[PDB]
């Protein structure tokens, strides 16, 4: 009943693999719906073709800025920003999917995939999903990151959508 979405990753145009994600629509329905709809592109905009602009090995992979491709843009299906829905779920380890933001109630489209336990983000960032398949592809992506987050190659979401 919780949606599964997938991302097909490419590194400088060449296919790397697929990562799928379970979205916790049961606990964070509004946040889960925003990610799901941007993954299918059904509202007319979304993640397809966008890049992961910030990857820091041992911490996280960040993407979701489909309008400025660098951390300064993006928007939700509800408008520019939307509220923190709740903080029920915690950043308990690698594989966690969480919303990036710029302050309270400033969720747009940017998100990060944790590759480590990041307990200090609890109560500041809304957790809404986790990697279901392809954690090994997220580990492969990390090796293209760096300490300041700049990627040595262009990491893009070549395709995305809903599996269930």
CATH of the domain at 19: 2.40.100.10
Solved using: X-ray
Q: Which domain holds residue 65?
A: 1-164
User: How would you list the strands of the sheet with 111-114, edge to edge?
Assistant: 54-56, 60-63, 111-114, 96-99, 127-133, 14-23, 4-11, 155-162
Q: How far apart are CA 4 and CA 154, in angstroms?
A: 25
159 strand-pairing partners: 8
Active site residue 101: yes
Three-state SS at 74: coil
Q: Give yes or no for a contact between 94 and 75, defined as CB atoms under 8 angstroms apart.
A: no
Tokens describing residue 41: 């592109």
Active site residue 62: yes
- Resolution of the structure, angstroms: 1.6
- The Cα-based distances of 15 to 38, 60, 106 in angstroms read 21, 21, 33
Active site residue 86: no
Active site residue 38: no
Opening angle at CA 82, ends 64 and 5, nearest 5:
40
Of 130, 111, 132, the residue nearest 64 (C-alpha)? 111
Q: How far apart are CA 55 and CA 37, in angstroms?
A: 24
- Is the C-alpha dihedral spanning 132, 133, 135, 137 positive or negative? negative
Please count the structural domains in the chain.
1
Among residues 7, 82, 101, 144, the one annotated as catalytic is: 101
Q: How far apart are CA 28 and CA 40, in angstroms?
A: 18
Greatest alpha-carbon span in the chain: 38
């Amino acid at each position: 009943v919780n949606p599964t979405v997938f991302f097909d990753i490419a590194v400088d145009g060449e296919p790397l693999g697929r990562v799928s994600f379970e979205l916790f629509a049961d606990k964070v329905p509004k946040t889960a719906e925003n990610f799901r709809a941007l993954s299918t592109g059904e509202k007319g905009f979304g993640y397809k073709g966008s890049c992961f602009h910030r990857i820091i090995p041992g911490f996280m992979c960040q993407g979701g800025d489909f309008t400025r491709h660098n951390g300064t843009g993006g928007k939700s299906i509800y408008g520019e920003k939307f509220e923190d829905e709740n903080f029920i779920l915690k950043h308990t380890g690698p594989g966690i999917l969480s919303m990036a933001n710029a302050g309270p109630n400033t969720n747009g489209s940017q998100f990060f995939i944790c590759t480590a336990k990041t307990e200090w983000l609890d109560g500041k960032h809304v957790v809404f999903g986790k990697v279901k398949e392809g954690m090994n592809i997220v580990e492969a992506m990390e090796r293209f990151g760096s300490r300041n987050g700049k990627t040595s190659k262009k990491i893009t979401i070549a395709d995305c959508g809903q599996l269930e």
